[PDB]
Design a protein around this nucleic acid. Structure first.
Ligand code: MG
Ligand code: MG
Ligand code: MG
Ligand code: MG
Ligand code: MG
Ligand code: MG
Ligand code: MG
Ligand code: MG
Ligand code: MG
Ligand code: MG
Ligand code: MG
Ligand code: MG
Ligand code: MG
Ligand code: MG
Ligand code: MG
Ligand code: MG
Ligand code: MG
Ligand code: MG
Ligand code: MG
Ligand code: MG
Ligand code: MG
Ligand code: MG
Ligand code: MG
Ligand code: MG
Ligand code: MG
Ligand code: MG
Ligand code: MG
Ligand code: MG
Ligand code: MG
Ligand code: MG
Ligand code: MG
Ligand code: MG
Ligand code: MG
Ligand code: MG
Ligand code: MG
Ligand code: MG
Ligand code: MG
Lengths: 127, 58, 148, 185, 49, 159, 222, 51
RNA sequence: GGGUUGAUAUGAUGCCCUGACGAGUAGGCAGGCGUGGAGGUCAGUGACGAAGCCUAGACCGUAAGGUCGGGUCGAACGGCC
RNA sequence: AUGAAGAGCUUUUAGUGGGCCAUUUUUGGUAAGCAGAACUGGCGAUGCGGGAUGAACCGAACGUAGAGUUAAGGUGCCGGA
RNA sequence: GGAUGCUGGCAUAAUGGUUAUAUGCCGCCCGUCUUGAAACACGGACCAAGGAGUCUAACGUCUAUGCGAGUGUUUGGGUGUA
């Protein structure tokens, strides 16, 4: 159902991890640039981690697209969902985390009626 | 504790970054330092010349 | 405000934009105007010639009301007449009906001749005037009558 | 690699898209960039560039300046264009019947120009009256008349108005300003 | 401490000025008080001006 | 101690010459200098008045003023990252016309003559100078000029 | 305003004339080149017959290639390379031979390889790596309309007339060669021939005047 | 959108040059020369063979 | 550096075309991410489970970070200007 | 002659004001990986291939990738040839 | 002035992602002063939370806005849903 798109290319599927997030627990994995005068990572010696830069950017045709080819749009109710009535081949709905189980039923029913794809049609389902 | 006294190292690179431009040349340069005995006459001569052209194409 | 400030951008960077060698320090050249005749001399001579020394004559207990002499140039001199009657007086360029302009009530102490009032007669009441201003007024056909 | 002769990735150094967030000015820009794009007239480009300018590069233009400009030969029946504001001047006592196109008019300027029989015009009505700049006369105001320019270029033997708050005797009138006190500049 | 081309500033803050800083937050309330006082005085001299 | 005076390092420069000491010939004083004339500066050491600083030796400038005994010359002087214009009041013994301008003006009037001559028939003067071009083809004869064969010579001492 | 047939046909007709003109001009240029070769050949022959020597005309054109990277160049060679538009390694430019340019080349000799190009390599360069400076942009030529629009002032209509103005060094060589963007050449496909580049071609290196061996190198680089 | 190289792609070759059609028709890349009966002088040969 | 307001549809700071370029400490500038609180709005989420916490489970973004699922929990909390 | 990559102009402000190495010129010193100058180029601020190893030497300067060709240096094995 | 046509298999963990491990090659400890740090130079055993260019008076350049030869309501007064 998705709109035709090219092969999706990423150029770096590996998460850029902070230097020594593997060595110290106080050092979190969220990327920080090394600003040190003698940093091997800042100086880009062979054999060190890679630094994020703009050349790794994704093609503007395939940016923000999930592997299904849809752009994700968060919804909390049927009125927010109905904005994607005429955009089913481009945008897929994601029900927000804080939505209740009984309202997820309504959102999923209306999305099935309108032909809208839902990325998480299994949250808070009992059986 | 001695130190380095003087070197002209890097000064040509620095100057030529935005450098050795000629200052510039204008038409009608300054009459500054020119002889006052000449300036005093040039004033009157220019006055008369302006008057003459005015009365000419009046 | 605080969020458009470069302090927010220097977060992460060690020196906060002040350098590693120079090391932002308390008062490395002195406090205030220290060194004007010394290590700040070139600045004080390049940008403040005349700062050092005393020139002239002292005045003890100077009141800035003996010297209240605000100046009005001739070029305006009809602004002191409202727009309602200005055109009237300008088209009826006549003696026997000439407009009176008390410049003191308007807040001026001296009249000066910058340029070119029209050829209309005008009565100008002023504490002080200038030679050229009065020349121009009476050449236009008016008169300066002095007051106090 | 490249041995580069120039500086790479340098901005032109010229303003586009005026940083004023005024929507009416943005609309004037939308009109005049279209006209500059399609009319082949230099007037449109001049006006478009002038609409980008800052306030100090858009000084006011006096009606007396306009009167001077119309006292030129062949300029009496022309349309004066001021990309900026027009201010009044009581130092004139006659004003002609011209038409004046400008962004803003002061109340006094508008009243003078109208009382003289003229009309005060906007740059959008100028666009329909003169899309290529027919019979126009662009006036710019004085830039170096400002106070800040007095201090630009301060140094010995320039004569350039030191930066000073309180003036009078004993404020920068001493050593460095007279041979009796050391030296004169 | 003297630096690029700038005016000589005479800022008189070399005493313990922070101990003596009166910020007139009381402007509005003190106006209200003046109006109430004028009202009370007028009522007390009820015919007088 | 150090020493940076006016005539420092001028020993051989303000030397006069070999077998040309003494007074100066009168052509120096009978030459005529108008404003705009280009003049080279070469200091005479026997005339201590009106001298240039050693910097202006071998410098070429333009006249801006003329007085009783002296001439006002403008020079361009490199000071750091820019050029400043310098005004010297030099006596004429330290001054001679530059021959470059004379050789340029001769070419000016010659080009004008050529243009007026060849405008009478329209033949595309092409007055610009051009660099020395590569040399064209030619033929070399051996008539009386048969090639003389040569060889490297051995090593000898010659002492 | 149907305009899809009449004006289209008129445009096609106007193009037919330009192509006829180009065809005849190119035939003339071929006849010129072949005669210019055959005549110097026969002149050498005739001088040998008469017992004389034929000194061929010194060349009017060289092709210069930058052989050295951009680091560690003194200022005078750096400026001369910028003036010849050789701003990267293996960039190439045609140079008119004059006393004003031979000294330039003597200055930049340890950084370039130059020599005398042939019609074949000039033609191959202009056809494979042929780029023009149009409004400060590097446009592939790919058609004669670009050349007619940007050099039609100077009698030039075709890539072939351009090659002719180059090789038969004409009045408008300056403008043609400036129109031509510097040739961006690859490294030689067979190698440089020597083990070590930065000696003179004479001493077993690569830089300097390799008078007629530059065609081989350039064809390997193009 | 793509630089097609002449010296291959005969179509682009002919777009640039119409003379390329008759060049091949006449095989001007393999033109034969008129034979000549010129012989050098004795001075040339003896100077060449000289020691 | 240029093109493109034409009516009908969405964004003129938009879309599009063309060419070139891309190292970087100190330092400068710009565009963005995230936090506590304030005004406005989504008649936003929420005891049918808010926030927080754990999760070699998933997705988006060059990254800052954002989103989802599961577990735990119990009362509040977010998106946009 | 060649080239111009836009030319010219102004305002304001940061950091810096310990330097070091190589070729060549050169001073003191027996000499120094010593001290001090001149010109350029570099390190500092710079990773990459080579020099086993190295701040500076050779080569070459860096967005992310693919293919090809090469520089310097190499092709008994370690080691691609 | 940029690849289309024909055919087959699978239609699932098969490709792919993540993760651990193995293998080949590379890979010195961060931060800091310094010409020069992996240093036999200094700090750092670990973790959480807290933790450092702020506010003000007076100014400068620039920018934006309002009016414009004028400009500044807010010391104060009037009024008020305070
Ligand atoms: Mg960690
Ligand atoms: Mg470092
Ligand atoms: Mg020092
Ligand atoms: Mg700073
Ligand atoms: Mg510090
Ligand atoms: Mg400091
Ligand atoms: Mg590059
Ligand atoms: Mg001598
Ligand atoms: Mg091979
Ligand atoms: Mg080799
Ligand atoms: Mg392309
Ligand atoms: Mg643009
Ligand atoms: Mg930094
Ligand atoms: Mg929960
Ligand atoms: Mg974990
Ligand atoms: Mg509770
Ligand atoms: Mg400074
Ligand atoms: Mg300083
Ligand atoms: Mg220090
Ligand atoms: Mg340092
Ligand atoms: Mg390097
Ligand atoms: Mg070398
Ligand atoms: Mg490869
Ligand atoms: Mg092997
Ligand atoms: Mg797998
Ligand atoms: Mg696999
Ligand atoms: Mg695996
Ligand atoms: Mg592992
Ligand atoms: Mg290793
Ligand atoms: Mg040390
Ligand atoms: Mg050690
Ligand atoms: Mg210790
Ligand atoms: Mg210590
Ligand atoms: Mg310790
Ligand atoms: Mg904390
Ligand atoms: Mg007032
Ligand atoms: Mg008041």
């Amino acid at each position: 159902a998705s709109l035709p798109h090219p092969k999706i290319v990423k150029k770096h599927t590996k998460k850029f991890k902070r230097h020594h997030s593997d060595r110290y627990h106080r050092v979190a994995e969220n990327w920080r640039k090394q600003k040190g005068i003698d940093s091997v990572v800042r100086r880009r010696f062979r054999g060190n981690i890679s630094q994020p830069k703009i050349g790794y950017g994704s093609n503007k045709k395939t940016k923000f697209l999930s592997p299904s080819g849809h752009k994700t749009f968060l919804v909390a109710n049927v009125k927010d969902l109905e904005t994607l009535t005429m955009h089913t081949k481009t945008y897929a709905a994601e029900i927000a985390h804080n939505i209740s189980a009984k309202n997820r039923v309504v959102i999923l029913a209306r999305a099935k009626a309108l032909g809208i794809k839902v990325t998480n049609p299994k949250g808070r389902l009992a059986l | 504790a001695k130190s380095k006294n003087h070197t002209a190292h890097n000064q040509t690179r620095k100057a030529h970054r935005n450098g050795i431009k000629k200052p510039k040349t204008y038409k009608y340069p300054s009459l500054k330092g020119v002889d006052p005995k000449f300036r005093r006459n040039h004033k009157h001569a220019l006055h008369g010349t302006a008057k003459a052209l005015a009365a000419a194409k009046k | 405000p605080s969020r458009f400030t470069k302090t927010r951008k220097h977060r992460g960077h060690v020196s906060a934009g002040k350098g590693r060698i120079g090391k932002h320090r308390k008062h490395p050249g002195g406090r205030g105007m220290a060194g004007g005749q010394h290590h700040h001399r070139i600045n004080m001579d390049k940008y403040h010639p005349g700062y050092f020394g005393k020139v002239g004559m002292r005045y003890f207990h100077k009141q800035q009301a003996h010297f209240w002499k605000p100046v009005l140039n001739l070029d305006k001199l009809w602004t002191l007449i409202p727009e309602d009657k200005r055109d009237q007086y300008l088209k009826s360029a006549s003696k026997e009906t000439a407009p009176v302009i008390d410049t003191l009530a308007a807040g001026y102490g001296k009249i000066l001749g910058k340029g070119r009032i029209p050829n209309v007669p005008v009565i100008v009441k002023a504490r002080f005037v200038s030679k050229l201003a009065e020349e121009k007024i009476r050449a236009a056909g008016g008169v300066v009558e002095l007051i106090a | 690699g490249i041995d580069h002769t120039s500086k790479q990735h340098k901005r032109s150094g010229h303003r586009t898209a005026p940083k004023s967030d005024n929507v009416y000015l943005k609309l004037l820009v939308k009109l005049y960039t279209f006209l500059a794009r399609r009319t082949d007239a230099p007037f449109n480009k001049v006006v478009l560039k002038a609409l980008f300018l800052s306030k100090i590069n858009r000084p006011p233009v006096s009606v007396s300046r306009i009167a001077r400009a119309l006292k030129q030969e062949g300029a009496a029946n022309k349309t004066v264009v001021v990309v900026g504001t027009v201010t009044d001047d009581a130092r004139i006592f006659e004003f002609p019947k011209t038409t004046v196109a400008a962004l803003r008019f002061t109340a006094g300027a508008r009243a003078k120009i109208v009382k003289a029989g003229g009309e005060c015009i906007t740059l959008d009505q100028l666009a329909v009256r003169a899309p290529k700049g027919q019979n126009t006369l662009i006036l710019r105001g004085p830039r170096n008349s400002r106070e800040a320019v007095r201090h630009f270029g301060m140094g010995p033997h320039k004569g350039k108005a030191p930066r000073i708050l309180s003036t009078g005797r004993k404020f920068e009138r001493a050593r460095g300003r007279r041979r009796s006190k050391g030296f004169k500049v | 401490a003297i630096s690029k081309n700038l005016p000589i500033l005479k800022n008189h803050f070399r005493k313990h000025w922070q101990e003596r800083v009166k910020v007139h937050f009381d402007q509005a309330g003190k106006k209200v008080s003046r109006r109430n006082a004028r009202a009370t005085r007028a009522a007390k001299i009820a015919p007088r001006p | 101690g150090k020493s940076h005076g006016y005539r420092s390092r001028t020993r051989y420069m303000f030397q006069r010459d070999f077998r040309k000491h003494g007074a100066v010939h009168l052509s120096t004083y009978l030459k005529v200098y108008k404003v705009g004339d280009i003049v080279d500066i070469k200091a005479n050491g026997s005339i201590q008045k009106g001298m240039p600083h050693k910097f202006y030796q071998g410098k070429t400038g333009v006249v801006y003023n003329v007085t009783k005994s002296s001439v006002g010359v403008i020079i361009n002087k490199m000071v750091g990252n820019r050029y400043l214009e310098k005004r010297l009041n030099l006596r004429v013994e330290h001054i001679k016309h530059s021959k470059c301008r004379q050789e340029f003006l001769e070419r000016v009037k010659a080009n004008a003559a050529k243009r007026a001559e060849a405008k009478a028939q329209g033949v595309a003067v092409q007055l610009k100078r051009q660099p020395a071009q590569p040399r064209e083809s030619r033929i070399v004869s051996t008539e009386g000029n048969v090639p003389q064969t040569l060889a490297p010579v051995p090593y000898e001492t010659f002492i | 305003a149907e305009q899809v047939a009449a004006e289209r046909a008129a445009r096609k007709a106007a193009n037919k004339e330009k192509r006829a003109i180009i065809l005849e001009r190119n035939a003339a240029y071929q006849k010129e080149y072949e005669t210019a070769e055959r005549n110097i050949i026969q002149a050498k022959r005739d001088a040998k017959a008469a017992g004389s020597y034929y000194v061929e005309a010194q060349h009017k054109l060289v092709f210069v290639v930058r052989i050295k990277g951009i680091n560690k160049i003194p200022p005078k060679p750096r400026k001369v390379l910028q003036l010849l538009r050789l701003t990267r390694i293996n960039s190439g430019t045609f140079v008119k031979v004059t006393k004003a340019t031979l000294e330039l080349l003597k200055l930049i000799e340890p950084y370039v390889a130059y020599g005398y190009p042939s019609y074949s390599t000039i033609r191959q360069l202009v056809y494979k790596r042929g780029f023009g400076k149009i409004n400060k942009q590097r446009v592939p030529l790919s058609d004669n309309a670009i050349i007619e629009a940007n050099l039609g002032k100077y009698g030039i209509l075709s890539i072939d007339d351009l090659i002719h103005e180059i090789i038969t060094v004409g009045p408008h060589f300056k403008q043609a060669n400036n129109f031509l963007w510097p040739f961006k050449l690859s490294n030689p496909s067979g190698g440089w021939g020597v083990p070590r580049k930065f000696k003179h071609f004479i001493q077993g290196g690569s830089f300097g005047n390799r008078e007629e061996f530059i065609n081989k190198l350039v064809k390997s680089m193009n | 959108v793509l630089k097609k190289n002449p010296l291959k792609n005969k179509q682009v070759l002919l777009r640039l040059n119409p003379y390329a059609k008759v060049f091949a028709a006449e095989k001007l890349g393999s033109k034969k020369a008129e034979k000549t009966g010129t012989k050098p002088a004795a001075v040339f040969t003896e100077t060449l063979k000289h020691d």
